[PDB]
């Protein structure tokens, strides 16, 4: 459960992507 | 720049207490994690609700300042006063 929890990371997204 | 990166620290810290804290109570978890499930645009969007009172944002204060200072700061370049 914890890789379904952990999908869609916006801390482990790039910089970039996250501004 | 910064704004994002203040973002992406807090929500690795409250992340990682709510997985060490999961362990006391699981039933909590999967209502707690749902931010961390949602598509990342998706997070962003309720991650940045913070505007106005409604305030269901889990966001830290200071973060929430820094972006209320910034779009006033904003609004009056652009003015909107």
Same mark, same amino acid.
């Given at each position: 459960?914890?890789?379904c929890?952990?999908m869609?990371?916006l ?9 | 720049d ?5 973002? #992406?620290? =807090? #929500?690795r810290?409250r992340? =990682?207490?709510?997985? #060490?804290?999961?362990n006391m109570?699981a039933?909590? /978890?999967?209502?707690? /994690?749902?931010?961390?499930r949602?598509?990342? #645009? @998706?997070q962003i =969007? ?5 505007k106005?009172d ?8 200071? $973060?929430r ?6 779009? @006033?700061?904003?609004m /009056?370049?652009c003015g $909107? @006063?």
């Amino acid at each position: 459960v914890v890789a379904c929890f952990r999908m869609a990371p916006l801390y482990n997204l790039p910089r970039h992507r996250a501004v | 720049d910064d704004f994002v990166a203040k973002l #992406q620290d =807090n #929500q690795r810290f409250r992340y =990682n207490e709510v997985m #060490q804290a999961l362990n006391m109570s699981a039933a909590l /978890t999967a209502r707690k /994690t749902k931010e961390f499930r949602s598509p990342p #645009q @998706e997070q962003i =969007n309720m991650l940045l609700n913070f505007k106005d009172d409604k305030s269901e944002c889990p966001c830290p204060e200071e $973060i929430r300042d820094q972006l209320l200072d910034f779009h @006033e700061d904003l609004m /009056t370049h652009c003015g $909107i @006063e």
